[PDB]
């Protein structure tokens, strides 16, 4: 029964990820909200707050949203493969078979249970050969979360904030004396999506790689 | 008027320190004013390294901490050289023609920062390990 539910979750992931990519491609040349989309290319910020609002209307943004769904999909795939094989390698297949049919089992007997040693790679009493993976695990969480900053907060807040920094630099003696060659400006609209997603996805993979390797190497 | 007028703005107890620092002083050449900036900055940069370092109860903590301090001056000698190549591309003129506005003496500033920086790092090494 556990394998049944997950296979439809994986199916859900493959269909939804394809949906985002297919709708983005088929509407790339144009839609009702933007009939001449093809004239602006693959990647452009939007088309302003008019016509109701047009954020994330470019074909590039569709790929961008789909990167969140693939990670989720490949995550559910790798989460499943790891937990199932974990029982199989320990010869105690009963844990997966009974706990995987409800999500609290995936939260208590998979993530929380197998993170016991990893999270103890170093502590107030010492450190073991898993301190690297434990540091990387925390490292991954921080850069994952750092991506949320670019994805939730947009250009305008930052551009106005940067202006006060430009003012402050120019009016402070012993620092005024030196100058930038390139005028400081906030990251672009498209740039931020890319920078946020890159942090998110580097963090997504680096966190899981640290856990996967350390959890399995600890018990074998 | 463009600039705001606070009662503590344009105060001579504050503006007098600016016109007599070795960055705005009138008589200094770029070799002299870079020697004075480096002698002050190198003197306190060996401060944090010798009592906050990876090795502090050693032979050893004062020598290696002072070695890290001249390590920053030769790094900031490169940044002062990198800022000079970028911001003075042919020593781009301007309205005021200071050392910092158009360069025109900038290679003497970066060299003077290195002598006064690495000297006062080594001078403060004499005052902690000896004296």
């Amino acid at each position: 029964p556990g394998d049944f539910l997950v296979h439809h979750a994986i199916a859900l992931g493959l269909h939804t990820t394809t949906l985002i990519l297919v709708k983005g491609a088929l509407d790339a040349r144009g839609s009702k909200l933007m009939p001449d989309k093809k004239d602006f290319g693959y990647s452009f910020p939007c088309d302003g707050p008019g016509r109701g609002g047009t954020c994330d209307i470019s074909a590039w943004d569709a790929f961008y949203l789909a990167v969140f769904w693939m990670l989720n999909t490949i995550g559910w795939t790798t989460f499943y493969w790891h937990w199932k094989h974990l029982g199989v390698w320990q010869g105690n297949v009963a844990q997966f078979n009974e706990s995987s049919t409800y999500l609290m089992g995936w939260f208590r007997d998979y993530l929380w249970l197998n993170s016991s040693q990893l999270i103890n790679g170093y502590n107030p009493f010492g450190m073991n050969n898993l301190s690297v993976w434990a540091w990387m695990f925390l490292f991954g969480h921080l850069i994952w979360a750092t991506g949320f900053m670019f994805l939730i907060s947009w250009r305008g807040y930052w551009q106005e904030l940067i202006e006060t920094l430009v003012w402050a630099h120019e009016r402070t003696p012993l620092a005024n004396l030196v100058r930038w060659k390139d005028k400081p400006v906030a990251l672009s609209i498209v740039q931020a999506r890319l920078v946020g997603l890159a942090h998110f996805a580097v963090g997504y993979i680096v966190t899981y790689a640290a856990f996967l390797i350390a959890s399995t190497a600890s018990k074998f | 008027i463009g600039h705001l007028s606070t009662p503590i703005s344009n105060s001579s107890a504050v503006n007098g320190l600016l016109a007599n620092l070795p960055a705005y002083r009138k008589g200094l050449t770029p070799r002299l004013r870079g020697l004075e900036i480096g002698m002050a900055h190198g003197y306190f940069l060996t401060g944090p390294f010798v009592e906050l370092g990876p090795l502090r109860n050693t032979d050893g903590g004062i020598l290696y901490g002072s070695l890290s301090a001249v390590g920053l001056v030769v790094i900031l000698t490169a940044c002062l050289a990198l800022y000079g190549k970028a911001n003075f591309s042919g020593s781009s003129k301007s309205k005021d023609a200071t050392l910092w506005e158009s360069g025109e003496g900038w290679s003497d500033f970066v060299s003077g920062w290195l002598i006064g920086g690495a000297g006062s790092v080594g001078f403060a090494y004499l005052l902690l390990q000896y004296i």
């Binding site: 060659k181 390139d182 | 790094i75 490169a78 990198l82 190549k85 970028a86 911001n87 591309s89």
Partner: peptide, 30 residues
Amino acid sequence: NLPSILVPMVGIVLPAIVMALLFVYIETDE
């Protein structure tokens, strides 16, 4: 032994050189 020499070169010295090489290349002009 050769690890002790090489990992501060490409860890500290060589990134300081290529960042110096790329920074002058960016801010040059015709």
